[PDB]
Amino acid sequence: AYATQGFNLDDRGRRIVVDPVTRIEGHMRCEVNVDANNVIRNAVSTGTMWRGLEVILKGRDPRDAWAFVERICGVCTGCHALASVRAVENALDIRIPKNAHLIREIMAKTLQVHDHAVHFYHLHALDWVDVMSALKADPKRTSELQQLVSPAHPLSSAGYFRDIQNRLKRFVESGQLGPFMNGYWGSKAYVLPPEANLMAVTHYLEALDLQKEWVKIHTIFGGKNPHPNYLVGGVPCAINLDAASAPVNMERLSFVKARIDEIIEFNKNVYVPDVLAIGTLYKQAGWLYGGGLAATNVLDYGEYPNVAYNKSTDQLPGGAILNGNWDEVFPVDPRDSQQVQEFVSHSWYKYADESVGLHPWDGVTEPNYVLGANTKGTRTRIEQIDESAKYSWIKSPRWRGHAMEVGPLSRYILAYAHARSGNKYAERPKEQLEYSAQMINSAIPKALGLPETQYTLKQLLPSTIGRTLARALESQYCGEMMHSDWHDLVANIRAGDTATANVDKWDPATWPLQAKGVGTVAAPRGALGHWIRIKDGRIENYQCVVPTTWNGSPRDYKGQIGAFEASLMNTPMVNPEQPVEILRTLHSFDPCLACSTH
Amino acid sequence: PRTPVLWLHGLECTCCSESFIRSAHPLAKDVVLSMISLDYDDTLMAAAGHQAEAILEEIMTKYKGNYILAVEGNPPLNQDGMSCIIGGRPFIEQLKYVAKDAKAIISWGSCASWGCVQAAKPNPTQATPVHKVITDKPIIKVPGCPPIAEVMTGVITYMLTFDRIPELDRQGRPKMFYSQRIHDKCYRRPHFDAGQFVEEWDDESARKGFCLYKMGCKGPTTYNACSTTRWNEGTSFCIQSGHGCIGCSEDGFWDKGSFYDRLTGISQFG
Ligand code: NFU
Ligand code: SF4
Ligand code: SF4
Ligand SMILES: [Cl-]
Ligand SMILES: [Mg+2]
């Protein structure tokens, strides 16, 4: 047992293992210890996959790198390609044309919306929603609930809900439950009424149909989804209005606009209101657990500048907050060797000296799969993992030695802090947050006949509910932003600027004989960076530090815990053999394990 | 009774699972609710840990020799297989266990079919395609990174309707989707045929949709349905949106030189 970061870790209690953790991307094992009252008092995050993309990149052409690293992840598809082209452009001093900038932004914001909305409905919802309780809902009362939760949503009649209910009823009564097989339905961890459950299941099915429409924006600009194409120096989708034979013409741009307008409607009428309503009801039950490191330490690189290449105009302004002090945002520099560093003290890698953290320009990825002396089981049949030694394929990123949480919640806390110090670019996230707090505290309770509460944003945001909320709000904001980007793109094209690629430094004969660069992206799950060194036209070193690397990290040399482990601490489980609360909180980070390990 | 599908995940990026749910005809929603019984799938399933693992035993017993094994990703052989761990054990052990009573095996995507990105040199995990580990079972390869959504649901639809694996070419790919090269029906062919090429990105030729061969397009040596069926309900494909085909459905495409280096012997493809 030891104390770190205000947490008292203790492994004396009953050990519980969740392997596999499902409804995530990739492979994770989670272990906890619970005390005599089923409260979590220790948590262990294990990344159970590795591919070695950083190793595979060595010796290859920097212009090709985006395609390799894009395949780090098919869920956050394209965010690695963006980081890569940005990193190479940074190394080679390439400025991309305005249209390439705007098209990349539109693609990035499309990913944000698709990733967030799919995550909530298809991966997260089943931790809050009991699908079997939806069978017992009254269709009329579900319609009435729908009209309170989201008056403007047109799909709200009693017959529509009854039809959805009957299809679910038939599916269940077949005895082949499929994805609902062996679920935790009926657990006292579930608090929603039948009507809310049926509403949520209906939206699950709606989102599953709609999500395939949104990604057609990627298909237009990048050819396909998943894994759209990118380009060092700009975008491949050349522009011409006055042929049918250009990748981008006005008809293609009008099609993109129609998809954007659909996204805006979905975020405002379905996604945000569902999360506010579900969040309100779990708040009423007192389920404010899962804050973890969000209560103290948060980080983002900052993204979406109003003016290209001008970081002061970031519309999700970044930096770092420490010790819960929201009145002070420290600037974050991905080039500073004393800021972002990765340890492997408790990871399955080797450094010369594992008492130190390496900045990614000096990063090393040498596998070292070895288990500690306290392991129960064998090298190929683990029963209980030994967290005192090496226990994960995820490295341990730290910022000036501090453990940080990243993601939409971090960005929204940063945006709120920036707004209160006078940053006007953060005004919309601030507005979203204040609106959300008033809905959760007053409007929704009053509409449902529940008592009103008086939680501040400081109290509400650092929680599993807050983390889930921030994701939904970010989706909405991203939709709104790409609507403006579209208008800027069309305006720029109509004013006569059709440029999509700067090819001045395409040929490696024009390059400096050595160079280094960094590209950062506000990926759906948080702060992403790619750091490249180039020598004689080839990749000398390529290191990625990915959002789930931050959040899912094992302990560092000092024994400080990462965001997943901290967030599970001090949470009661109704039944320690049913991991409902573990899954609810882990899923609130939207863990991407292939990303985390690459 | 809907046919059970046990969908395993090895080393992967999850692009295959994502592509699957983009299907317009049929909807993935209709596939899961009305066509198959998707009884195990790490990305969507409600159960976790011990409750998830117990499903495999139940389905294999009750539907012995009558469930489909779908595999996304691949098993690593290095690190004693523990560069991909499931339930504390190597993934290769899970794969071998579930494969033994399967009536058919689908290798989804280039990872399962051939190895894909993690198998590119120097392959630090010795990631190995499914057919090199499972040698005594009927396998269908559906390559591509990822494959087209309608190709994936097309294969499922065929298998469920007919209770048969469709006719395969000698590489194990279904002829109904992988019989044509991209270059056969690519809409830029008339430019290729007239020697009209993009030489630099965003040149006048690129704005007219000229052929991408000299920019590295690997369509002349790549078998897939992208030029005709296209992507995301027939919206576009790599070439239509301006980037050459990188050859993502072909075995070992990551190690066939730079994506922007042209194929040699252009007369070959006329
Ligand atoms: N968002 C996201 Fe990926 Ni699949 C993570 N973690 C990021 O770069
Ligand atoms: S016609 Fe063949 S090389 Fe030109 S598939 Fe590649 S762009 Fe079409
Ligand atoms: S890289 Fe694009 S056109 Fe070639 S998706 Fe079709 S075979 Fe892969
Ligand atoms: Cl391959
Ligand atoms: Mg890394």
PDB file of N, CA and C and ligand atoms in Angstrom, chain A residues 54 342 349 360 364-365 395 529 542-546 549 595-598, ligand 5:
ATOM      1  N   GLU A  54       6.235   2.084 -34.799  1.00  0.00           N
ATOM      2  CA  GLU A  54       7.379   2.975 -34.699  1.00  0.00           C
ATOM      3  C   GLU A  54       8.655   2.313 -35.235  1.00  0.00           C
ATOM      4  N   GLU A 342       8.235  10.088 -21.913  1.00  0.00           N
ATOM      5  CA  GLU A 342       7.637   8.763 -21.692  1.00  0.00           C
ATOM      6  C   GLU A 342       8.567   7.864 -20.891  1.00  0.00           C
ATOM      7  N   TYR A 349       8.849  -2.591 -22.233  1.00  0.00           N
ATOM      8  CA  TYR A 349       9.908  -2.050 -23.094  1.00  0.00           C
ATOM      9  C   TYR A 349      11.170  -1.893 -22.274  1.00  0.00           C
ATOM     10  N   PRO A 360       9.948  12.462 -27.080  1.00  0.00           N
ATOM     11  CA  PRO A 360       9.785  11.551 -28.234  1.00  0.00           C
ATOM     12  C   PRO A 360      10.770  11.708 -29.398  1.00  0.00           C
ATOM     13  N   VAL A 364      12.579   5.592 -27.742  1.00  0.00           N
ATOM     14  CA  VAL A 364      13.099   4.274 -28.061  1.00  0.00           C
ATOM     15  C   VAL A 364      11.968   3.285 -27.841  1.00  0.00           C
ATOM     16  N   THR A 365      11.814   2.347 -28.767  1.00  0.00           N
ATOM     17  CA  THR A 365      10.794   1.321 -28.669  1.00  0.00           C
ATOM     18  C   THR A 365      11.410  -0.053 -28.893  1.00  0.00           C
ATOM     19  N   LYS A 395       3.285   2.714 -22.882  1.00  0.00           N
ATOM     20  CA  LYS A 395       4.273   3.562 -22.216  1.00  0.00           C
ATOM     21  C   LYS A 395       3.602   4.524 -21.239  1.00  0.00           C
ATOM     22  N   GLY A 529       0.423  13.418 -30.602  1.00  0.00           N
ATOM     23  CA  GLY A 529       1.613  13.931 -31.246  1.00  0.00           C
ATOM     24  C   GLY A 529       2.445  12.868 -31.940  1.00  0.00           C
ATOM     25  N   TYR A 542      10.776   7.755 -35.515  1.00  0.00           N
ATOM     26  CA  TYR A 542       9.363   8.121 -35.555  1.00  0.00           C
ATOM     27  C   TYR A 542       8.755   7.630 -34.241  1.00  0.00           C
ATOM     28  N   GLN A 543       8.296   8.556 -33.419  1.00  0.00           N
ATOM     29  CA  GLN A 543       7.655   8.240 -32.146  1.00  0.00           C
ATOM     30  C   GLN A 543       6.281   8.904 -32.055  1.00  0.00           C
ATOM     31  N   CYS A 544       5.297   8.111 -31.643  1.00  0.00           N
ATOM     32  CA  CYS A 544       3.939   8.581 -31.414  1.00  0.00           C
ATOM     33  C   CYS A 544       3.642   8.518 -29.919  1.00  0.00           C
ATOM     34  N   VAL A 545       2.992   9.553 -29.418  1.00  0.00           N
ATOM     35  CA  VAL A 545       2.414   9.569 -28.084  1.00  0.00           C
ATOM     36  C   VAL A 545       0.956   9.939 -28.287  1.00  0.00           C
ATOM     37  N   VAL A 546       0.080   8.998 -27.936  1.00  0.00           N
ATOM     38  CA  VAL A 546      -1.291   8.979 -28.392  1.00  0.00           C
ATOM     39  C   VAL A 546      -2.216   9.219 -27.177  1.00  0.00           C
ATOM     40  N   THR A 549      -2.509   6.488 -24.767  1.00  0.00           N
ATOM     41  CA  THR A 549      -1.212   6.304 -24.111  1.00  0.00           C
ATOM     42  C   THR A 549      -1.165   7.122 -22.814  1.00  0.00           C
ATOM     43  N   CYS A 595      -4.462   2.343 -30.563  1.00  0.00           N
ATOM     44  CA  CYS A 595      -3.855   3.661 -30.499  1.00  0.00           C
ATOM     45  C   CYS A 595      -2.811   3.777 -29.425  1.00  0.00           C
ATOM     46  N   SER A 596      -3.155   3.308 -28.236  1.00  0.00           N
ATOM     47  CA  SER A 596      -2.326   3.515 -27.057  1.00  0.00           C
ATOM     48  C   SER A 596      -0.953   2.856 -27.204  1.00  0.00           C
ATOM     49  N   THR A 597      -0.894   1.747 -27.942  1.00  0.00           N
ATOM     50  CA  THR A 597       0.300   0.914 -28.018  1.00  0.00           C
ATOM     51  C   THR A 597       1.013   1.031 -29.370  1.00  0.00           C
ATOM     52  N   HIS A 598       0.244   1.212 -30.445  1.00  0.00           N
ATOM     53  CA  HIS A 598       0.774   1.356 -31.807  1.00  0.00           C
ATOM     54  C   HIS A 598       1.963   0.426 -32.110  1.00  0.00           C
TER      55      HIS A 598
HETATM   56 MG    MG C   5       4.913   5.674 -28.765  1.00  0.00          MG
END
